[PDB]
């Protein structure tokens, strides 16, 4: 019994116990902001050399920083905030983390247990509020159960589909001293079923019949280091073209001939065409989000027909049962970690040297469906697509890893389309919730996770405006991030929809921008401004060559649609393609309708 109890924490405050448990969980970075309720914990971590503390300007900043840290490192991102407004300010990042499967462990101070439920000073019901945007939350009620709750939080956050958890820490608990022994298992952090094994064999048999297979890969494949390796091994062995979600970008080397690029609403029309014509869809760590499937009832016709005929269908490798058969019926559901299950799957799959007819179609679709757009003309502004390509081409010249974060909007889609993705965890973007303001703090967090990487925030001007105060935080953290603001002086993605569906009635979608160069100067950040085509190359080089935080502003063409586009309600292969004459007519119509204002 003495062997099962631990007394080594006796005499410590809850705060000191928190500090010790952080260490035992190999936490090397904490993002947070002080306040009254969380003071006992802040006193305990005072001048700690055991981890780096990152101080934002706003707790939303801390949340998104921790998300960026988590996406870049594969470790849980740890947040430490005070009660009340400190806690409610992390709600958007928690909801963000939930939608995108990001392991976020949020510790929020709380008013003393004697004051809870009295509408106390700086008291929020954060457990109630955050219940719908966490995998799990808890309020620690005494110091003896604090190690257990910390263990549970980290475990739940990082297993299954990763996600945010919140642990509420009353001030009197974290100030109290442990007087009793606790189970030694709480002071320490932490086979394939017959059913799954049979499903795997059945799925392999199905794939071995396929004549038009396609791999549809997502974020799940990134949650294991061997993930991308096994994905490639499968695609090579069975000779299968690979498409990814926005969140799967980097899982497959896009320079590979088998790469179909990104699928979905703004993905490649070649990818969208191929998945609509495939007889076998291998879904690896992807959840069939509504940005990807198009009109659900019209999605994957050829795979549905194949399943009914016993010669194909959908093979879904998914770790979370909630997401199995949620949107589309899986022909075979393979539950568990996709990477681990691929190890069992692949040796049952027949090696295939050639698929002449399938790959003839694939290669034809790729040739006819590039990411085309209207090029610059003499005197015109820089096109946003051209800027992205310029940044992508120059960024590879360096002998360093390149990590990209984005805001939300057109710039995000163009970044997705026009970068060439080759490495896992290099696309760090808000996809499920789609939070503007994400780009800058996510970049700081990723840069902290990866001090030797080039970290680039491709940001819209409206998105960037939302959290631009965190520039100071990059300087204070020593994070030499590279922010590129595409200045089109509009909420481009909304105006695209207003041009398309509301007859060019731009309702409150043009916000005023600060002078970004003077803003950078005020934040002690290097500033670069590119205003014309002739400055593009040299401007981007100065940007990438910088060894300090740097803000690049680029003046880009306004009222330019992201294409291709699958409009809401349309089948995944019923897309709009770029056309020069159509664009010209669209400009004329916009000009007349707005009286030349746009």
Ligand X SMILES: Cc1cc2nc3c(=O)[nH]c(=O)nc-3n(C[C@H](O)[C@H](O)[C@H](O)COP(=O)(O)OP(=O)(O)OC[C@H]3O[C@@H](n4cnc5c(N)ncnc54)[C@H](O)[C@@H]3O)c2cc1C
Ligand Y SMILES: Cc1ncc(Cn2c(C)c(CCOP(=O)(O)OP(=O)(O)O)sc2=O)c(N)n1
Catalytic sites, residue numbers: 59, 121-122, 171, 493
DSSP letter at 26?
T
Contacts of 324 (CB under 8 A, 6+ apart): 316, 318, 330, 333, 335
In the chain, the N- to C-terminal Cα span, in Å, equals 78
Contacts to ligand 6R4 from residues 173-212, by CB under 6 A: none
Contacts to ligand Y from residues 410-469, by CB under 6 A: 410-411, 434-436, 460-463
Contacts of 413 (CB under 8 A, 6+ apart): 266, 493, 562
Contacts to ligand Y from residues 35-74, by CB under 6 A: 35-36, 59
**Residue 337 touches which of ligand Y, Mg ion, ligand X, none (Cβ within 5-8 Å per kind):** ligand X
Q: Which residue stretches of 396-478 are H helix?
A: 410-418, 439-449, 461-467, 471-477
Q: Which is nearer to a copy of itself, 364 or 515 (CB)?
A: 515
Q: Which stretch binds a copy of itself (CB under 8 A): 220-228, 355-363, 498-506, 557-565?
A: 498-506
Q: Which H or E element spans position 154?
A: helix 146-158
**Residue 186 touches which of a copy of itself, ligand X, ligand 6R4, none (Cβ within 5-8 Å per kind):** a copy of itself
CA–CA distance, 193 with 199 (Å, rounded to integer): 10
Binding status of residue 398 toward a copy of itself by CB under 8 A: no
Q: Is 463 part of any known ligand binding site? A: yes
CB hemisphere CA count around 217 (13 angstroms): 33
Contact 415, 458 (CB under 8 A): yes
Q: Is 338 part of any known ligand binding site? A: yes
Q: Which stretch binds Mg ion (CB under 5 A): 92-100, 324-332, 456-464, 578-586?
A: 456-464
DSSP letter at 203?
H
Residue 581: burial class (beta carbons within 10 Å; 0-12, 13-18, 19+):
exposed
CA–CA distance, 409 with 559 (Å, rounded to integer): 13
Binding status of residue 296 toward ligand 6R4 by CB under 6 A: no
Q: Is 492 part of any known ligand binding site? A: yes
**Residue 219 touches which of Mg ion, ligand X, a copy of itself, none (Cβ within 5-8 Å per kind):** ligand X
The size of the interface with ligand X (CB under 6 A), counted in residues, is 38
- Contact letters for a copy of itself, residues 450-489 (x by CB under 8 A): ---------------xxxxx-xx--xx-------------
Q: Which H or E element spans position 74?
A: none
For tokens 């014309």, what's the residue?
Answer: 532
What distances in angstroms separate CA 285 from CA 9, 28, 218, 320, one per listed residue?
41, 28, 5, 10
Residue 573: burial class (beta carbons within 10 Å; 0-12, 13-18, 19+):
middle
Binding status of residue 27 toward ligand Y by CB under 6 A: no
Binding status of residue 339 toward ligand Y by CB under 6 A: no
Contacts of 78 (CB under 8 A, 6+ apart): 22, 27, 29, 30, 31, 66, 105, 107
Binding status of residue 298 toward ligand 6R4 by CB under 6 A: no
Q: How far is the CB of 38 from ligand 6R4 (least distance, A)?
A: 9
Phi-psi region of 588 (alpha: psi -120 to 50; beta: other; left: phi over 0): alpha
Backbone angles phi, psi at 503, to 5 degrees: 50, 45
Contacts to a copy of itself from residues 127-166, by CB under 8 A: 128-133
Q: How far is the CB of 229 from ligand 6R4 (least distance, A)?
A: 31
**Residue 445 touches which of ligand X, ligand 6R4, Mg ion, none (Cβ within 5-8 Å per kind):** none
Q: Which is nearer to a copy of itself, 194 or 452 (CB)?
A: 194
Q: How is 513-557 classified by DSSP, letter by letter?
A: PP-HHHHHHHTT-EEEEE-SGGGHHHHHHHHHH-SS-EEEEEEB-
- Residue 123: alpha-carbon gap to chain centroid: 31
DSSP letter at 220?
G
Contact 240, 315 (CB under 8 A): no
Cis peptide before 564 (omega within 30 of 0): yes
Binding status of residue 407 toward ligand X by CB under 6 A: no
Contacts to ligand Y from residues 491-510, by CB under 6 A: 491-494
Contacts to ligand 6R4 from residues 76-135, by CB under 6 A: 83, 111-112, 115, 120-122
The size of the interface with a copy of itself (CB under 8 A), counted in residues, is 104
Q: Is residue 169 classed as helix, strand or coil in its secondary structure?
A: strand
- Contact letters for ligand X, residues 157-186 (x by CB under 6 A): ----x-------------------------
Q: How far is the CB of 37 from ligand Y (least distance, A)?
A: 8
CA–CA distance, 137 with 79 (Å, rounded to integer): 14
- Contact letters for a copy of itself, residues 61-90 (x by CB under 8 A): -----------------------xx--xx-
Binding status of residue 551 toward ligand Y by CB under 6 A: no
Contact 44, 447 (CB under 8 A): no
Residues forming the annotated binding site for Mg(2+)?
461, 488, 490
Residues forming the annotated binding site for thiamine diphosphate?
410-411, 434, 436, 462-463, 488, 492-493
User: Which residues bind to ligand Y, rule: CB under 6 A?
Assistant: 33-36, 59, 82, 85-86, 89, 407-411, 434-436, 460-463, 486, 488, 490-494
User: Which residues bind to ligand 6R4, rule: CB under 6 A?
Assistant: 36-37, 39, 83, 111-112, 115, 120-122, 171, 265, 290-291, 493-494, 497, 568
Residues forming the annotated binding site for FAD?
161, 219, 223, 245-246, 263, 266, 287, 289, 291, 318, 323, 337-338, 431
User: Which residues bind to Mg ion, rule: CB under 5 A?
Assistant: 460-462, 488, 490, 492
């Amino acid at each position: 019994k003495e062997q099962l109890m631990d007394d080594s924490f006796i005499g410590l405050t809850g705060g000191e116990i928190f500090h010790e448990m952080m260490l035992r969980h190999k936490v090397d970075t904490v993002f947070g902001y002080a306040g009254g309720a969380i003071l006992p914990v802040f006193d305990a971590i005072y001048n700690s050399d055991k981890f780096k503390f990152v101080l934002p300007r706003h707790e939303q900043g801390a949340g998104h920083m921790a998300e960026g840290y988590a996406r870049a490192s594969g470790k849980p991102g740890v947040v430490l905030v005070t009660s009340g407004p400190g806690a409610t300010n992390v709600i958007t990042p928690m909801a963000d983390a939930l939608m995108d499967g990001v392991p976020l462990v949020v510790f929020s101070g709380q008013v003393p247990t004697t004051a809870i439920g009295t509408d106390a000073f700086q008291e929020a019901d954060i457990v109630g509020i955050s219940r719908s945007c966490t995998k799990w939350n808890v309020m620690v009620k005494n110091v003896a159960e604090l190690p257990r709750r910390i263990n549970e939080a980290f475990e739940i956050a990082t297993t299954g589909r990763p996600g945010p958890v919140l642990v509420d820490l009353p001030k009197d608990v974290t100030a109290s001293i442990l007087r009793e022994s606790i189970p030694i298992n709480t002071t320490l952090p932490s086979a394939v079923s017959e059913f799954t094994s049979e499903a795997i064999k059945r799925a392999a048999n199905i794939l071995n019949k396929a004549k038009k297979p396609i791999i549809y890969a997502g974020a799940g494949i990134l949650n294991n280091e061997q993930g991308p390796k096994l994905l490639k091994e499968l695609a090579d062995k069975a000779n299968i073209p690979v498409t990814t979600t926005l969140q799967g970008l980097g899982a497959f080397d896009q320079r590979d001939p088998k790469s179909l690029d990104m699928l979905g609403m703004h993905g490649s029309a070649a990818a969208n065409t191929a998945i609509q014509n495939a007889d076998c869809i291998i879904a690896l760590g992807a959840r069939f989000d509504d940005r990807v499937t198009g009109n659900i009832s019209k999605f994957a016709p050829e795979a549905k027909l194949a399943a009914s005929e016993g010669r194909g269908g959908i093979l879904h490798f998914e770790i979370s049962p909630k997401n199995i058969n949620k949107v589309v019926e899986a022909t075979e559901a393979i539950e568990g970690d996709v990477t681990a299950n691929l190890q069992s799957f692949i040796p049952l799959v027949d090696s295939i040297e050639n698929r002449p007819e399938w790959f003839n179609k694939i290669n034809e679709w790729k040739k006819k469906y590039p990411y085309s757009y209207q090029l610059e003309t003499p005197g015109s502004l820089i096109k946003p697509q051209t800027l992205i390509k310029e940044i992508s081409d120059q960024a590879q010249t360096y002998n360093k890893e390149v990590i990209v974060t984005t805001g939300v909007g057109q710039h995000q889609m163009w970044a997705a389309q026009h970068f060439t993705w080759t490495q896992p965890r290099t696309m760090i973007t808000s996809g499920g919730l789609g939070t503007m303001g994400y780009g800058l703090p996510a970049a700081i967090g990723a840069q902290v996770a990866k001090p030797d990487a080039i970290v680039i925030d491709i940001d819209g001007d409206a998105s960037f405006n939302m959290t631009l105060t965190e520039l100071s935080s990059a300087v204070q953290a020593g994070a030499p991030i590279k922010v590129c603001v595409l200045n089109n002086e509009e909420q481009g993605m909304v105006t695209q929809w207003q041009s398309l569906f509301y007859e060019h009635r731009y309702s409150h979608t043009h916000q005023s921008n600060p002078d970004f160069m003077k803003l950078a100067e005020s934040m002690n950040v290097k500033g670069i401004r590119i205003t014309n085509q002739q400055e593009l190359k040299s401007g981007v080089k100065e940007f990438l060559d910088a060894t300090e935080p740097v803000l690049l502003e680029v003046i880009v063409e306004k009222k330019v649609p992201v294409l291709p586009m699958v409009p809401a309600g349309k089948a995944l292969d019923d897309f709009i393609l770029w056309d020069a004459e159509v664009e010209k007519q669209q400009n004329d119509l916009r000009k007349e309708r707005t009286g030349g204002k746009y």
